[PDB]
Design a protein around this ligand. Structure first.
Ligand SMILES: N[C@@H](CCC(=O)O)C(=O)O
Ligand SMILES: N[C@@H](CCC(=O)O)C(=O)O
Lengths: 88, 132, 231, 135, 98
């Protein structure tokens, strides 16, 4: 009872805890958590941009296909008043 | 014809990339589409067929890492280039017969365009799941 | 002082400006360029109904897409609806990549220096990976035996508990051992030896950290002879 | 304390490019983009006084093209050509200067992040679900 | 610190050299760096404008942080591991039931 309080008073417990937990920082993140790498951009980062780019092409081509479909074969100034009165 | 030949040669292939891996468990690697075949070892030319099976933290429905693999280890975008490419090659072949309607060969080139659009997606998803 | 193997740094080559995008991205941006321009051609010259009314073609389109990609403007714009709805996609496509390009080139043009490993010998007491030794029958090896500073005490503990011998017999022995250990065995010597080994070929060694103490070379005489005061 | 395994480093998804700006800002962008184009449509085509209406080329869809054109740094062919649409357009130019310069400040830091997932922390799903065991 | 305090005694009896120099500065003080009650030092730091720090225990510290006007702040980590307890006279019968 009188002995453990001496070791608590003089920091010997702190020294032992440091020795057997903190001086043996070995694995990964404790050591390498405070370092820095710059970059190198790979394709896995930028992929949805290409996906959007390709999908927009097919959408645009599909639009002109049905444009040529319709012009191979608003309405009633008048009922525009109906449209705007129901819209209001 | 040259594009159809080159695309068929490119699909039915063991040699696309070269890296370092294994041949068959349970090495410079002559790796391709699914036959991750190998050379320069104890035996040269035993082509293991590969698919996806990691040992992860059990991603349940992690879609950008799952559905991506689903489109990866079943080539549907690279295979569709062959389909559209021969589909248009028939239409340019059918140009002579049933002619003087001045409309048919317009339909042909759309296949050749869209096959490339499938190809470019297939390349991106393959490079994606190599580093996936 | 502490001598280690100098890690071989990389030099920027001739084409060191294509660095903040990899070659996969460089070929995909070439592919998609051709694809976008030929799609814009296809949708433009499509018999609208008269025919030479619109101004686009394969050639106009090929440098329109380039002039939209690099921010230099254009001479003409798509007027048809599907031409506009395909041009906006390319406008969005450039704003992500070229911005990434400049914002990352600003990251390559800040730093080139390596992160400098096991400096100031405290991690030499901490880690167990890279070994280290001194010269046998040496004042430094005696200094770590008699030293009472706790980090030096733990260093002496690791040196006396060694498998195999971390100690060497002559200086060039430890020199060759560090030249072949590939960063797995450090070496302790004196700073004049250290800078002399640095100023020779093949320059593959390196002094890290500062000093540790202040020793000094002197002239030694037997005790009591008459040469002492004239020397 | 609760020990579990290590998780795997979740890399950012498909729609991560719009990540550095929060969604509410993107909402206000779309609303302001509609409003600016419609207000610019109103200032022109307002009986300009045999050309008495077709003095300008700004229809509603041409304005819808012009605003999107001016936002992403490539101006279109036409120009407002008269007063009082231009004190829309200059304010929209100031808007597109202040916004995308704030967009592209640190974009590359947002495309390599790799943060973790952390299924449970204060356990209580070890009460709730039946899947993950514990002893 | 606080006078008639365990912390003030701890820096007297402490042997770590940085704490020794801190005790040296505390005993060589012009005027008194020591106070008599807790709220005295609280008001002294609230009026010293960053010219007088204060040492206390972390529970007091977080309680003072969680009050108005919130003008105070805990900096750094901890220093040791003390503990509050129940105190009895030596040898009485209340010890083991408490
Ligand atoms: N001058 C030193 C060199 C070796 C050492 O530093 O231990 C000696 O003669 O002992
Ligand atoms: N619990 C302590 C508070 C004062 C101090 O930390 O010095 C005591 O009663 O002594």
């Amino acid at each position: 009872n009188l002995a453990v309080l001496k070791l608590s008073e003089q920091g010997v417990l702190d020294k032992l805890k440091n020795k057997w937990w903190y001086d043996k920082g070995e694995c990964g993140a404790k050591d390498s958590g405070s370092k820095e790498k710059t970059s190198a951009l790979s394709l896995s980062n930028v992929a949805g941009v290409f996906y959007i780019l390709v999908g927009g092409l097919g959408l645009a081509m599909l639009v002109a296909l049905i444009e040529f479909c319709y012009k191979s074969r608003l309405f009633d100034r008048g009922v525009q008043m109906l449209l705007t009165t129901v819209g209001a | 014809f040259a594009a159809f030949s080159l695309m068929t040669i490119a699909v039915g292939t063991d040699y696309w990339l070269y890296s370092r891996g294994v041949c068959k468990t349970k090495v410079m690697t002559h790796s391709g589409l699914w036959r991750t075949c190998c050379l320069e070892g104890n035996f040269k030319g035993l082509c293991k067929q590969i698919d996806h099976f990691p040992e992860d933290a059990d991603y349940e429905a992690d879609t950008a890492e799952y559905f991506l693999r689903a489109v990866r280890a079943s080539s549907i975008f690279p295979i569709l280039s062959v389909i559209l490419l021969f589909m248009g090659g028939l239409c340019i072949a059918a140009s002579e017969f049933y002619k003087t309607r001045h409309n048919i060969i317009l339909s042909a080139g759309i296949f050749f365009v869209s096959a490339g659009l499938s190809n470019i997606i297939g390349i991106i998803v393959y490079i994606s799941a190599n580093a996936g | 002082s502490i001598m280690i193997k100098k890690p071989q740094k990389s030099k920027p080559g001739v084409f060191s400006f294509l660095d903040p995008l990899a070659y996969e991205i460089w070929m995909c941006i070439v592919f998609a360029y051709i694809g976008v321009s030929v799609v814009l051609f296809l949708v433009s010259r499509f018999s609208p109904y008269s025919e030479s009314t619109n101004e686009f073609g394969i050639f106009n389109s090929l440098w329109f897409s380039l002039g939209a990609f690099m921010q230099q403007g254009c001479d003409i714009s798509p007027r048809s609806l599907s031409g506009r709805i395909v041009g906006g996609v390319w406008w969005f496509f450039t704003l992500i990549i070229i911005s990434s390009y400049t914002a990352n080139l600003a990251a390559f043009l800040t730093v080139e220096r390596m992160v400098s490993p096991i400096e100031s010998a405290e991690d030499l007491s901490k880690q167990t990976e890279i070994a280290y030794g001194t010269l046998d029958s040496g004042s430094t090896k005696e200094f770590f035996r008699r030293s009472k500073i706790a980090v030096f005490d733990k260093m002496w503990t690791y040196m006396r508990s060694a498998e195999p011998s971390v100690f060497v017999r002559t200086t060039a022995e430890g020199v060759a051992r560090v030249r072949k250990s590939k960063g797995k065995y450090a070496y302790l010597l004196e700073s004049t030896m250290n800078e002399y080994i640095e100023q020779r070929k093949p320059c593959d060694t390196m002094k890290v950290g500062g000093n540790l103490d202040s020793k000094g070379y002197g002239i030694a005489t037997p005790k009591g002879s008459s040469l002492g005061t004239p020397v | 304390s609760i020990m579990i395994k290590k998780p795997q480093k979740s890399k950012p998804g498909v729609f991560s490019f719009l990540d550095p700006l929060a969604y509410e800002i993107w909402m206000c962008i779309v609303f302001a983009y509609i409003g600016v184009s419609v207000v610019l449509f109103l200032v022109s085509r307002f009986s300009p006084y045999q050309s008495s209406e077709s003095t300008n080329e700004f229809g509603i869809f041409n304005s819808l093209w012009f605003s999107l054109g001016a936002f992403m740094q490539q101006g279109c062919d036409i120009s407002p050509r008269s007063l009082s649409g231009r004190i829309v357009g200059g304010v929209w130019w100031f808007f597109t200067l202040i916004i995308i310069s704030s967009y592209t400040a640190n974009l590359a830091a947002f495309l390599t992040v790799e943060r973790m997932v952390s299924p449970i922390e204060s356990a209580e799903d070890l009460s709730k679900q039946t899947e993950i065991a514990y002893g």
